[PDB]
Design an enzyme around this catalytic site. Structure first.
Site, PDB file in Angstrom:
ATOM      1  N   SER A 106       0.820  -1.205   0.000  1.00  0.00           N
ATOM      2  CA  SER A 106       0.000   0.000   0.000  1.00  0.00           C
ATOM      3  C   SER A 106       0.857   1.260   0.000  1.00  0.00           C
ATOM      4  O   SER A 106       0.505   2.255  -0.642  1.00  0.00           O
ATOM      5  CB  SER A 106      -0.940  -0.004   1.206  1.00  0.00           C
ATOM      6  N   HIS A 129      -0.487   2.399   8.863  1.00  0.00           N
ATOM      7  CA  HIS A 129      -1.205   3.402   8.080  1.00  0.00           C
ATOM      8  C   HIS A 129      -0.731   4.780   8.541  1.00  0.00           C
ATOM      9  O   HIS A 129       0.202   4.895   9.338  1.00  0.00           O
ATOM     10  CB  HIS A 129      -2.724   3.226   8.211  1.00  0.00           C
ATOM     11  N   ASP A 170     -10.563   3.062   6.354  1.00  0.00           N
ATOM     12  CA  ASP A 170     -10.611   1.719   6.916  1.00  0.00           C
ATOM     13  C   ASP A 170     -11.584   1.661   8.088  1.00  0.00           C
ATOM     14  O   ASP A 170     -11.510   2.474   9.014  1.00  0.00           O
ATOM     15  CB  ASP A 170      -9.217   1.285   7.363  1.00  0.00           C
TER      16      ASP A 170
END
Ligand SMILES: *[C@@H]1O[C@H](CO)[C@@H](O[C@@H]2O[C@H](CO)[C@@H](O[C@@H]3O[C@H](CO[C@H]4O[C@H](CO)[C@@H](O)[C@H](O)[C@@H]4O)[C@@H](O)[C@H](O[C@H]4O[C@H](CO)[C@@H](O)[C@H](O)[C@@H]4O)[C@@H]3O)[C@H](O)[C@H]2NC(C)=O)[C@H](O)[C@H]1NC(C)=O
EC number: 3.4.21.89
Lengths: 86, 174, 179, 148
Positions: D44, D84, D110
């Site tokens: 990601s 993240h 998310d």
């Protein structure tokens, strides 16, 4: 018997002063190439080409070190004394 | 294999000549002390692992940090005890019949073989406690008189050399 | 000597090369001890689309801000920082002490693309909505830009720029072409 | 048999195990948090962190975590540590700080645990704020993980 220990004792005989001077010159050439690469990375300011110069110096060191040279077997015929046989 | 393996086989051959010719009594203690230090450090490690596996970390931080500091102290003491006696000394032995008197006959051995050298050094030490006398014997020889061309280290010429060395130590003793 | 022993010595020398490049990166990170300033200039800010939405978790409010940018990245770029982020912190005030400087949108910047970025009247990429809705009844919002780095192998800090823009806000009104 | 070979094997095992676990426990004590030395296994963050990169963490260090920092939490549905980046933030004046996070090459926030009744994620699933990274060791870690 004592003949089993008599055989598995002796490794490859070496020229001690030649290998010591070769190791000192080896470390000197590698350190000098590292300093030249550091000056290149400081002035020209490139990292990947500096890593490429270091790897080229490593390949030069491998080509100068890895094969057994005739010089490295000629000096044990002079620096080492004559030894007995069976 | 290696010159260190040559030194190990040379010390083993000296012990074999000693066992075949004169049969003195072995000793221990330095390796036992090193194993004792390592056993205590493994005790710290096993207690730390069990106490960390049975208890969560923010309730087990300070005494685990104390165990890390204790490991630092024990490894520093191991380094200092290495620098005390593990420089050159290899073999410790008592001689025959130390009975009826004070404990005499401290027979001590040390070896020296430098990196990329054709010379060997053997230092013998005889300590007697009745008169409080130490006797040193520095033996600097060349290794080229014993090896051969393609892997036959002659013991039949090294054994009279150790015989002459033991005769010299017998002259130093008596 | 053994050829495998020479290969182990060359592997230890390659570990020494790894230590030497780690030492060079330590010299590089020891040279950039000072934090770099970035000049910011924001002139015209418009606040519109103020919609009060009865959220199921909290009475929220929707916002939409049209802004301007003017920056300079002359002495910022080096030969070891990999990628750069762009934030825009908006600082507001609520009743429940949510004194948050909060980010509208984000930007991915890779080297070799543009050494100096400047444009005008760009709208937001991400929709601004606040749950604690402290803007309604407030006459004070603070805008200040910040921007993140990532090096080749070192530690990444955050570097905040200069320029705090204070903008008022009415009580109950929908769309405004402000200045 | 000769016991000295057994004591030497115990010696070497003691050296390697005590050294490795001492480095691990000393790092995770001197950081302050539990601080696992994590390896990125997701693509990601690929313009920022490629596949197979090592990350070493630090403590919160008496500092409220504002926006513009990467956080590492644990997904319980797969039991995997995932990193993240914090975008939004919320504050409450009793020691409660909520935050919103996002990953690169994504479009949807998310959900995780909570979806619509409360804020998006929880402040207690985070392990800590990241400190530094190595791009070279993580590839070796992936190569060693190719043969588990
Ligand atoms: C809207 O409401 C605010 C809050 O009452 C008024 O005060 C301004 O608030 C902003 C941001 O809150 C200030 O801008 C920056 O604040 C940073 C945080 O400081 C806090 O703590 C100090 C006390 O120490 C408070 O005064 C402050 O309000 C914050 O709560 C500072 O760190 C910043 O410092 C900058 O300069 C230094 C050098 O001195 C650098 O080292 C820093 O990196 C940074 O660049 C900065 O000050 C602002 O200063 C506050 N005052 C003013 C006069 O703007 C607003 O005034 C109010 N607006 C209106 C229109 O009423």
């Amino acid at each position: 018997p004592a003949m089993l220990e008599h055989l598995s004792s002796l490794p490859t005989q070496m020229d001690y002063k030649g290998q010591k001077l070769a190791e000192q010159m080896f470390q000197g050439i590698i350190l000098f190439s590292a300093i030249v690469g550091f000056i290149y990375g400081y002035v020209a300011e490139q990292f990947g080409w500096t890593v490429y110069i270091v790897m080229a110096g490593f390949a030069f060191s491998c080509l100068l070190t890895l094969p057994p040279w005739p010089i490295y077997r000629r000096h044990p015929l002079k620096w080492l004394p004559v030894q007995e046989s069976s | 294999w290696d010159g260190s393996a040559v030194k190990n086989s040379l010390d083993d051959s000296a012990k074999k000549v000693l066992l075949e010719k004169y049969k003195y009594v072995e000793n221990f203690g330095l390796i036992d002390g090193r194993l004792t230090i390592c056993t205590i450090s493994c005790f710290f490690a096993i207690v730390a692992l069990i106490w960390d596996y049975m208890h969560p970390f923010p309730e087990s931080k300070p005494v685990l940090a104390l165990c890390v500091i204790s490991y630092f102290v024990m490894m520093g003491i191991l380094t200092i005890y290495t620098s005390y006696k593990e420089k050159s000394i290899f073999l410790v032995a008592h001689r025959k019949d130390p009975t009826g008197m004070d404990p005499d006959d401290i027979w001590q051995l040390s070896s020296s073989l430098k990196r990329f050298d054709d010379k060997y050094t053997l230092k013998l030490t005889f300590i007697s406690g009745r008169t409080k006398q130490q006797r040193e014997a520095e033996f600097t020889k060349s290794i080229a008189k014993f090896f051969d061309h393609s892997g036959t280290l002659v013991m039949d010429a090294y054994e009279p050399e150790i015989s002459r060395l033991h005769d010299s130590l017998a002259i130093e003793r008596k | 000597n053994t050829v495998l022993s020479r290969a182990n010595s060359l592997f230890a020398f390659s570990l020494s090369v790894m230590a030497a490049l780690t030492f060079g990166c330590f010299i590089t990170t020891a040279f950039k001890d000072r934090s770099v300033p970035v000049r910011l200039h924001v002139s015209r800010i418009m606040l519109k689309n103020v919609e009060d939405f009865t959220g199921p978790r909290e009475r929220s409010d929707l916002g939409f801000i049209t802004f301007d940018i003017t920056a300079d990245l002359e002495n910022i770029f080096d030969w070891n920082v990999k990628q750069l982020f762009l934030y825009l912190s908006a600082e507001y005030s609520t009743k429940n002490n949510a004194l948050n400087q909060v980010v509208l949108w984000d930007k991915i910047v890779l080297r070799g693309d543009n050494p100096k970025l400047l444009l005008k009247d760009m709208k937001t990429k991400y929709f601004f909505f606040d749950d604690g809705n402290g803007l309604k009844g407030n006459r004070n919002v603070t805008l200040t830009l910040s921007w993140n780095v990532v090096p080749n192998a070192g530690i990444l800090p955050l570097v905040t720029g200069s320029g705090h823009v204070s903008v008022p806000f009415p009580d109950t009104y929908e769309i405004t072409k402000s200045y | 048999m000769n016991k000295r070979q057994l004591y030497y094997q115990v010696l070497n095992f003691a050296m390697i195990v005590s050294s490795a676990l001492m480095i691990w426990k000393g790092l995770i004590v001197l950081t302050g948090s539990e601080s696992p030395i994590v390896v990125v296994l997701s693509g990601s963050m690929e313009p920022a962190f490629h596949r197979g990169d090592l990350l070493f963490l630090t403590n919160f260090r008496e500092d409220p975590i504002r926006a513009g920092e990467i956080v590492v939490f644990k997904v319980e549905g797969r039991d995997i540590p995932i990193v993240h980046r914090v975008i939004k933030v919320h504050e409450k004046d009793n020691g409660d700080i909520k935050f919103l996070t996002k990953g690169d090459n994504n479009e949807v926030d998310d959900r995780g645990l909570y979806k619509e009744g409360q804020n998006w994620l929880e402040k207690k699933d985070v392990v800590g704020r990241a400190r530094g990274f190595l791009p070279y060791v993580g590839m070796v870690t992936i190569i060693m993980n190719d043969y588990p």
